[PDB]
Design a protein around this ligand. Structure first.
Ligand SMILES: *[C@@H]1O[C@H](CO)[C@@H](O[C@@H]2O[C@H](CO)[C@@H](O)[C@H](O)[C@H]2NC(C)=O)[C@H](O)[C@H]1NC(C)=O
Lengths: 25, 49
């Protein structure tokens, strides 16, 4: 799986990080 | 440069930080646009930078 600030759009991070989700899984 | 300012370039107005670009334009081009059709680079009229 593969993947603007000038216009007031903000894409803030999730609460759980990917290294934390990795620990739950 | 390295401060944000109410800028204008040949009537291309905006507000933002100005800093030097690794991008090269062709000789006739004056400003650059991103994929969202929005301006993200401009040439200085007197220093062609
Ligand atoms: C506009 O005028 C400036 C001078 O104020 C020109 O810039 C000069 O360019 C020459 C040749 O490249 C340099 O030797 C000088 O050092 C430059 N002077 C300064 C202070 O920048 C500029 O070329 C002119 N623009 C046009 C389109 O003629």
């Amino acid at each position: 799986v593969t993947l603007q600030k000038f216009n007031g759009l903000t894409v803030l991070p999730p609460l759980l990080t990917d290294e934390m989700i990795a620990q739950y899984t | 440069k390295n401060k944000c300012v109410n800028f204008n370039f040949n009537g291309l107005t905006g507000t933002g930080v100005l800093t030097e670009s690794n991008k090269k334009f062709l000789p006739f081009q004056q400003f650059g646009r991103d994929i969202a059709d929005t301006t993200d680079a401009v040439r200085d009229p007197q220093t062609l930078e």
